[PDB]
Amino acid sequence: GPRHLMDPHIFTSNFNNGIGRHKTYLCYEVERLDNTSVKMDQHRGFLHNQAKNLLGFYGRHAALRFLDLVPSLQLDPAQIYRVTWFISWSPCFSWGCAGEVRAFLQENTHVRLRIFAARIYDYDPLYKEALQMLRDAGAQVSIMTYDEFKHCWDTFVDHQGAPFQPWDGLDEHSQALSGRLRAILQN
Amino acid sequence: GPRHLMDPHIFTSNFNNGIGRHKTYLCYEVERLDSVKMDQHRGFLHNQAKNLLCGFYGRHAALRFLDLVPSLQLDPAQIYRVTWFISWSPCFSWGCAGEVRAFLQENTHVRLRIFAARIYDYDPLYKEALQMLRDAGAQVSIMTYDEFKHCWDTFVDHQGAPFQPWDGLDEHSQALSGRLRAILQN
Ligand SMILES: [Cl-]
Ligand SMILES: [Cl-]
Numbered sequence: 398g399p400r401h402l403m404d405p406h407i408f409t410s411n412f413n414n415g416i417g418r419h420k421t422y423l424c425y426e427v428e429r430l431d432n433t434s435v436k437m438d439q440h441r442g443f444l445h446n447q448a449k450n451l452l453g454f455y456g457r458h459a460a461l462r463f464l465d466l467v468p469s470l471q472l473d474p475a476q477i478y479r480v481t482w483f484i485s486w487s488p489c490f491s492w493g494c495a496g497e498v499r500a501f502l503q504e505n506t507h508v509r510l511r512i513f514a515a516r517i518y519d520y521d522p523l524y525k526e527a528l529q530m531l532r533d534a535g536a537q538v539s540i541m542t543y544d545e546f547k548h549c550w551d552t553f554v555d556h557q558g559a560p561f562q563p564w565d566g567l568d569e570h571s572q573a574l575s576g577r578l579r580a581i582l583q584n
Numbered sequence: 585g586p587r588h589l590m591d592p593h594i595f596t597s598n599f600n601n602g603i604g605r606h607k608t609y610l611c612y613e614v615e616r617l618d619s620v621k622m623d624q625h626r627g628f629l630h631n632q633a634k635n636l637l638c639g640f641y642g643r644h645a646a647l648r649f650l651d652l653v654p655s656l657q658l659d660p661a662q663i664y665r666v667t668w669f670i671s672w673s674p675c676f677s678w679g680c681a682g683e684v685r686a687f688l689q690e691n692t693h694v695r696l697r698i699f700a701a702r703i704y705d706y707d708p709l710y711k712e713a714l715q716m717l718r719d720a721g722a723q724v725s726i727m728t729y730d731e732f733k734h735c736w737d738t739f740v741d742h743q744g745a746p747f748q749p750w751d752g753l754d755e756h757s758q759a760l761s762g763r764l765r766a767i768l769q770n
């Protein structure tokens with residue numbers, strides 16, 4: 398696996414819970430659950446969606462791009478793993494994102510998915526149904542807070558000593574988005 | 585470090601040896617000479633985007649590798665060869681050639697091999713950059729099909745799809761190879 402650190406400006410421009418970009422970024426961490434966990438820092442990495450090419454292929458969403466990644470991880474079917482996502486947008490439904498993830502968790506039962514969204518993709522009419530199907534699939538869906546933002550900065554960004562610097566209204570956007578998710582997940 | 589595969593279009597458009605792009609990509613590999621391919625010591629880099637406004641003038645791909653050297657944890661008791669698959673040939677008038685050459689002198693336990701996919705003649709002293717790199721004990725070459733195919737196989741998220749050389753890949757390679765050896769001739 399080739400190493401590549403995410404640049405500070407690309408991280409901040411994409412994971413700002415006030416800025417909405419036409420790109421989805423997906424920082425992922427794999428770890429094995431035992432009696433304690435076993436952190437597989439070997440398997441850290443991130444993804445974005447694939448750029449479309451109208452002149453003809455509409456690109457591939459980051460969620461699906463992680464599902465293409467799973468065999469490379471060579472997970473033990475006997476053992477159980479917890480996959481952690483720090484995804485830029487909450488996975489959609491109108492496109493086969495929430496659907497394929499549901500099928501994956503259903504088939505590969507040895508995987509627990511923990512998703513941290515920076516912001517909610519409400520530009521998809523069925524964004525509510527997306528988060529709900531993920532919840533039914535057994536995933537932990539929640540909103541990124543300062544802790545999760547500082548983590549990805551320390552873990553995935555070429556910071557070079559520079560500490561994580563919170564943008565204006567980071568906490569307010571978190572709390573606001575937490576309430577919306579709390580309403581969507583309220584059955 | 586975090587694993588991240590380069591996208592097909594990002595690779596094919598940047599490492600094209602006929603068309604120019606505004607940023608530099610640098611695929612690097614490390615191997616101990618005792619040769620053993622030190623996989624997981626490989627990855628790729630791009631120049632850090634400038635942000636004039638907050639007076640930041642970016643950082644070139646070559647220099648970003650130099651920052652990454654202590655991360656490698658190389659052994660002074662061993663001997664390594666670092667291979668560079670770089671989009672533009674390292675410049676001079678902005679400090680890449682001089683600082684890369686200087687690194688080789690401080691670190692004689694490492695030998696450098698540079699495969700440029702394109703000659704950065706935007707620098708008026710682009711020839712002096714290439715010559716300085718050679719005089720520092722580094723192989724200065726031009727990316728051929730072999731290197732492009734290797735980068736596609738190694739760094740690019742090809743998803744099983746084989747490497748498809750763009751139009752004029754071999755043609756431009758020869759022309760650029762003729763230019764380079766004519767430069768290093770002098
Ligand atoms: Cl990138
Ligand atoms: Cl860009």
Ligand SMILES: [Zn+2]
Nearest residue numbers: 402403404630
């Ligand atoms: Zn990058």
Ligand SMILES: [Zn+2]
Nearest residue numbers: 421458486489
């Ligand atoms: Zn999406």
Ligand SMILES: [Zn+2]
Nearest residue numbers: 458489492494
């Ligand atoms: Zn989607």
Ligand SMILES: [Zn+2]
Nearest residue numbers: 589590591594
């Ligand atoms: Zn990329």
Ligand SMILES: [Zn+2]
Nearest residue numbers: 605606607633
């Ligand atoms: Zn650009």
Ligand SMILES: [Zn+2]
Nearest residue numbers: 608672674675
């Ligand atoms: Zn350059």
Ligand SMILES: [Zn+2]
Nearest residue numbers: 644675678680
């Ligand atoms: Zn330069």
